[PDB]
Symmetry: C3
Subunit: 294 residues, 3 copies
């Protein structure tokens, strides 16, 4: 099915959910939850929020060790590095790429203010990956959470090895000199404010135009499954997001289930393929979201 439709770039088949963990304890717990739930979600080892004042070297070292370890069973653990303006972002790249033991799933690049910063970070990851003897390039996840990154979203989406564009609602709103009220940083405002609709739709349009998965910001409700599912459904059905971040384990199953294809849709997709392109995407989405494939 893959060898029969390939004149074009293959769309990445990625988990509907990306769970964040900053500490060794929470990274381990998340990796263990992947064993429990199946790789229905990816784990991002956070450096940007996780690393302390002057503990950047120690923290990236722990992250690299955690990703390289036997604890990382499914190899679906990536890392969020510091932003391109932070002096430790290169050091994070170097420590994690050289130390990850080739198990590094991706690198998440936050707070870039333009296409140039992203290109520089991807170029650097590539140089470090080459220098480490890595065969395949390290996939990159790029945050779109600044004015410049949104303005340059179509240029960013054309950069090499990007598999995800992440919408950063909080940092995006903070840059608007108080023109976007706080109420718009919560639902339903985040799907209705003209600037946020514009930003989300531009990001998704740029991502999908370039075979990139568009990923949605977290739900601020940590434990109410119905509220988490509602945000994931609005993001999936009204904007075209195919992935969503998680900051609390209770958020994973509602995100995965909201992003899942219909049971009858996958049944039909397998039958048609028993013999297209669309139905193959549906069957691949069903496997990645932990559903039974016929």
């Amino acid at each position: 099915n893959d060898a029969l439709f390939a004149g074009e770039k293959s769309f990445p088949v990625l988990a509907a959910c990306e769970h964040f963990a900053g500490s060794e304890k929470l990274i381990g717990k998340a990796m263990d939850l992947q064993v429990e739930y199946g790789p229905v979600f990816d784990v991002t080892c956070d450096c940007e929020d996780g690393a302390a004042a002057g503990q950047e070297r120690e923290h990236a070292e722990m992250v690299a060790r955690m990703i390289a370890s036997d604890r990382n069973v499914h190899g679906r653990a990536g890392a969020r590095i510091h932003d391109p303006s932070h002096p430790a972002w290169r050091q994070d790249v170097d420590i994690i790429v050289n130390g990850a033991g080739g198990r590094l799933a991706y690198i998440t690049v936050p707070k870039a203010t333009n296409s140039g910063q992203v290109a520089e970070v991807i170029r650097y990851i590539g140089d470090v990956a080459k220098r480490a003897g890595l065969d395949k390039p390290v996939p990159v996840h790029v945050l779109i959470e600044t004015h410049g990154a949104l303005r340059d979203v179509f240029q960013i989406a054309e950069l090499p090895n990007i598999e995800v564009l992440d919408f950063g609602l909080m940092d995006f709103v903070s840059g608007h000199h108080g023109a976007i009220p706080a109420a718009a940083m919560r639902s339903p405002g985040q799907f209705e404010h003209a600037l946020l609709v514009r930003a989300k739709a531009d990001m998704v349009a740029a991502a999908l135009a370039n075979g990139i998965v568009p990923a949605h910001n977290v739900c601020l409700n940590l434990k109410d499954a119905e509220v988490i599912a509602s945000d994931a459904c609005r993001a999936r059905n009204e904007f075209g997001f195919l992935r969503m971040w998680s900051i609390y384990p209770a958020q994973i199953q509602p995100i995965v289930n909201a992003m899942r294809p219909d049971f009858t849709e996958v049944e039909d997709a397998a039958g048609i393929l028993v013999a297209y392109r669309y139905f193959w995407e549906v069957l691949q989405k069903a496997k990645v979201t932990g559903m039974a494939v016929p």
Copy 2:
């Protein structure tokens, strides 16, 4: 530059039988709608020259009374698109109203097809260039919509909802391919509004995709009204004859508006009077 005064409706017909019937319906109704002879959906699997040769003959024939018959050729990646242009431009007897270009994935493909149409039209001894209708129905064509709208001889930008949605790796649900979703989904609002903004910025008519309801006049009228009054579309495609009159009437200027337009800023009122004529209304 004068804005193009085009019929509010564009009816599609793939077979000789349906092309003929559509041309006869233009005689019945008046040229309130254009006819697009469809080589893209209409042509058989490997009978592209035979079909193009039928289309050219139908457009050149006496049966085409109002000279408001264009053709939709194959997409720029299809091996028969140049052959469709060769056969239809050289064979149309100079009656060819326009060429509809579908599924272009970038500005380059559109420019190439326009350039080729121009070359064939010049060699065929055509005085005026063949007007072009460009489908915006891919990621690349939407990304490049402002660049496409600046290309020469384009008089229409057509929104291709179905092919546009199909390229979204299932991110746009099936419910959005129909009303009210096709006018409310953030990606579809964005795509439609970008296309209309690009078209109107360059004196091009923005045209809307078909209504999937073939015979219910109220549902067809509703789609044509939303596309006209919420998005700025000035034309809409038809795939069934029963869709023509609801589309034309939904796009018509207000009776009092035309009465005031005749009693004559002036470029606007002139556009209204010309719209009233093209839409088969009584001009005072």
Copy 3:
């Protein structure tokens, strides 16, 4: 030690009045300047040349505008002028007369109907030349109308041009360029906040303005005296689109626009507290917004 000198790695966001009142005659300019004395500089005054000036009275009208702006009547120095568009034969003459005449009190120049980035850049460069020759130390701030297809297409390029402090949304002229595709009903509320082309245009301009530390300003309310309707338009522009200013064409529109644009009383109380103990750039913007909108600063 001051809040302004403590944050300078970036450009400071302009602290402008929530309202901009237009007046085209000497009488109405006078009255608007007097109303700034009565209300406080909670609103700016734009001396309209563009609409104000008669058939061949462009020089005479710009001379009156310059005289009014330079006069003792202009107490708060919050009086700008709208010159003619870049295609108009009097725009340079308006700049010459008003800049050389304003006695250094000119608050800004409003540039209308530009059809591209190049026209805007040309007008700004010309204002700069005249400002420097008139002995002005600081450049004359510019307000640019986004009311054409070309200016909307080039909005991000326009927003990068020097000395722009406001991007104005010109609904009426923007709609008139759409060959009747935007109906008249969309030129009023709720259509002007809901028509796909208008949402797109307004959101693009606000996004371009805010991306470049420029204040996005909203078009007038066509209801001249109903405070509830004026407040409603100011609130939709403020809370759904991110506009931080709005035009006024009738004095009764000023207070509803200012009040709709005001920060919450508790928000300013907190902003003063955080800043005294001293994110801070946000709370500083809120405290400055409170002063410019005539609220009591703690």
